[PDB]
Design a protein that fits this description.
about 0% strand; repressor; phosphoprotein; endoplasmic reticulum; mainly alpha; Serine Threonine Protein Phosphatase 5, Tetratricopeptide repeat
Length: about 350
């Protein structure tokens, strides 16, 4: 009777669009009578209207537990399961809807959802099959299709991410893993994986804070911890080096980047990036011979590295090799038409050249 009054009010409030207030009434009704099946149903239609399926599901399955013939609630759960990619359980729900005297509308909705589930069910086999056969591009194709419908399927999301890492597309993989993490709570393994991918990418900082998220969920995570110790060190070293170059302490910065390559010799990006900064160090410390040797090395690997070009240029000028200095500025300027810093140096190199040419 208090329950009934709460139920009635909630219906009015729901009809009027006052969702939170409707929710409150249906909560009160459920609390007033924990066995009443419609109370849980009413509350679930409110969560559904808000679009909070995480909250709706337990109430939907409660209703079904209490009232197995309650076709409307089972139809709704079937929808959520299909979206979650729980294909077997979805089909099971839709199929049982068909056999519990559905209204005409419910019958059409369930038949429509059984056609689609069966498509997904077929596509899932093709996706898993292509993956087991190490055909990662075929797999993505199928997963693309599946994930359009099964949008809250965390594991197929992660499987597509695996495809992307294998396909040499780590940034795409990070993105799928991030999306997946928003759908699942147990995220430790995904956070670990993204932190790793950042690491291999050279993004030491994001790698570090990403591994911190892992340790925040589980402090004892052995793999996450072992990697934390590695990035933490590798990251402090780079932070120290950049701090040293800020204060003009070039030989200590060189020394610092030397140990940066020591502590991570496998991942190419850390030597290449370290060499670039060392190239910068020798240049700014006005030590031209060494500057041109290693700025050249960097440039062997990265012919378009603007910083290396500018720094080698600056080193050529000490050596009074004006022709080589301008040629390096021109290469840098080629893709950086508007960069004021390149212009200044090129025009400087040209003034110095003229000076020497005066008679």
């Amino acid at each position: 009777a208090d329950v009934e009054k709460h139920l009635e009010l909630g219906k009015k409030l729901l009809a009027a669009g006052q969702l939170a207030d409707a929710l409150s009434q249906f909560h009160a009704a459920v609390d007033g009578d924990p066995d009443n099946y419609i109370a849980y149903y009413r509350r679930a239609t409110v969560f559904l209207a808000m679009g909070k399926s995480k909250a709706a599901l337990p109430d939907l399955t409660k209703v079904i537990a209490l009232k197995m013939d309650f076709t409307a609630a089972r139809l709704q759960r079937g929808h959520l399961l299909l979206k979650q990619g729980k294909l077997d359980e979805a089909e099971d729900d839709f199929k049982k809807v068909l056999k519990s005297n559905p209204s005409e509308q419910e019958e059409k909705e369930a038949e429509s959802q059984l056609v689609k589930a069966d498509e997904m069910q077929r596509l899932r086999s093709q996706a898993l099959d292509a993956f087991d056969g190490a055909d990662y591009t075929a797999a993505i194709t199928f997963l693309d299709k599946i994930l359009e419908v099964c949008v809250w399927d965390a594991e197929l999301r992660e499987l597509r991410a695996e495809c992307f890492i294998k396909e040499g597309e780590p940034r795409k993989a990070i993105s799928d893993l991030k999306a997946a993490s928003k759908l699942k709570s147990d995220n430790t393994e995904a956070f670990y994986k993204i932190s790793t991918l950042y690491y291999q990418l050279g993004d030491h900082e994001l790698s570090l804070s990403e591994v911190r998220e892992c340790l925040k969920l589980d402090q004892d995570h052995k793999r996450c911890f072992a990697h934390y110790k590695q990035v933490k060190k590798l990251n402090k070293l780079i932070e120290s080096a950049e701090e040293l170059i800020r204060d003009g302490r070039y030989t200590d910065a060189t020394s610092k980047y030397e140990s940066v390559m020591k502590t991570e010799p496998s991942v190419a990006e850390y030597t290449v990036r370290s060499k670039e900064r060392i190239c910068h160090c020798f240049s700014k410390d006005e030590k031209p011979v060494e500057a041109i040797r290693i700025c050249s090395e960097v440039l062997q690997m990265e012919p378009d590295n603007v910083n290396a070009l500018k720094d080698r240029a600056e080193a050529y000028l000490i050596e009074e090799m004006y022709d080589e200095a301008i040629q390096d500025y021109e290469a840098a300027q080629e893709h950086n038409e508007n960069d004021q810093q390149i212009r200044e140096g090129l025009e400087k190199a040209q003034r110095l050249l003229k000076q020497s040419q005066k008679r």
